């Protein structure tokens, strides 16, 4: 695919771009657009750097980003959904998890995916039909069957605290039935590893168009399922997400119930 | 220091073995202690190449693992504390996340430790009395004055769950004036990333003495306090463990107060 190579070299760019701030951290220095939520530098130089490179080959094409809002081209039946760093609040503590995610939709269906870890040098791709991959690796999820002895990535509502005591219980009614949890303040490689088995399901609320929509892709190629907390598919006007394989989500959601 | 020295051998001659096991699953399978709690083929591999090369220099020492209990030497002022995987879990799921723990007690004071990922090859070391360093980059904690927007590493009590309700409960209290937790599967890398100030403070139920031996003193080298849930200092016994730095700390015991 032409637009695959294109999101890789722009995630690989920024992805660059990233890493060497991280090693040199001398000039990032964030900014507060919610409490507990923050920008730097690094986050609008590398979104620059994705807008510049997706518009050498494709400036007539729509881009949603997080930091700039929807700045629309004359193509307005391809759409690139960006985050440029996925896991800002652990970039400026210098915890070297984070990562660079890049979707594009056709017509209101997402094509290609990609989320590239540059601490890691971890490439995940996705092509509808075509199913997902990791360094060349084809990815399958997890094997699991049941709940029983699980890991679930999940995200605390620090940027919607109303639900804290409503999310509170949903983590004590899960941890009732499965075996622990894993909270790495990147939904984008959270996603990720759960369409490569690495962990078992997913669980947040409140995303954000861009926080899922690569990672979301990643884990229906691998066999996955995606849906909201009440089963349904209008997650999208939601953000609240449950990714898994169908039993594990199965099993998620009638717990949830 | 000569004991510095072979503690960082055994844990990059260790910390290889278990990276290549990675790379190569080959002949990675398990194995059930408790429920939730596994062992591998790997885990007791690089426990011997430890014990190995700790035994070239010192097999007088008494050498505790996780795996094989207290071997005393005919020396036993002085022992080493041997966690050889810690992260067992992530390490079978292929989550990129564990490292090998290293501590040496000299009649009952710990002079050296070392923790050491072999995925990031990154090496944290400390010596009493000389401070604490990430790769020679001395660390210095997090320079957090309160609780208001730090980021807490914590761990489940899946080999406790009668204290899961106690938990929960403990996890929401915090939230109510924390940001955001962390929960990554390793506790020695929990308290290393205390010590470097990638996360604000740590807490976990019934810790097991080689899972925090070495990283321990980590912390308390970066400046940084560890304690048990009541501030007392007899969490050797309890393994109930808070750490960070002294406000940090003293905002966590307030607030769990
Ligand atoms: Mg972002
Ligand atoms: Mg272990």
Redesign the interface.
């Known amino acids: 695919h032409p637009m695959l190579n294109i999101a890789v070299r722009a995630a690989r760019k920024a992805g660059n771009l990233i890493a060497k701030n991280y090693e040199t951290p001398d000039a990032v220095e964030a900014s507060q657009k919610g409490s507990?939520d923050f920008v730097t530098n690094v986050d609008k130089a590398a979104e620059a750097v994705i807008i510049d490179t997706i518009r050498k080959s494709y400036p007539q094409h729509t881009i949603i980003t997080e930091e700039s809002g929807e700045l629309e081209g004359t193509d307005q039946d391809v759409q690139w959904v960006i985050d440029p760093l996925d896991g800002t609040?652990?970039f400026i503590?210098?915890?070297?998890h984070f990562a660079v995610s890049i979707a594009v939709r056709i017509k209101g269906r997402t094509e290609v995916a990609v989320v590239y870890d540059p601490?890691?040098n971890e490439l995940f791709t996705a092509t509808r039909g075509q199913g997902a991959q990791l360094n060349g690796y084809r990815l399958r999820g997890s094997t699991a069957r049941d709940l029983d002895?699980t890991?679930l990535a999940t995200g605390?509502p620090?940027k919607a605290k109303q639900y804290?005591?409503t999310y509170?219980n949903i983590?004590?009614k899960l941890?009732?039935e499965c075996?622990?949890?894993?909270?790495?303040?990147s939904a984008a490689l959270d996603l990720a590893?759960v369409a490569?088995?690495?962990?078992d399901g997913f669980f947040e609320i409140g995303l954000r168009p861009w926080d899922f929509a690569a990672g979301e892709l990643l884990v229906r190629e691998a066999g996955g399922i995606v849906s909201d907390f009440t089963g349904g598919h209008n997650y999208m006007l939601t953000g609240n997400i449950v990714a898994g394989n169908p039993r594990v989500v199965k099993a998620m959601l009638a717990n949830m119930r």
């Open positions: 507990n609040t652990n503590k210098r915890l070297p601490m890691r002895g890991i605390f620090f804290a005591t509170i983590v004590g941890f009732n075996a622990d949890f894993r909270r790495t303040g590893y490569a088995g690495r962990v």
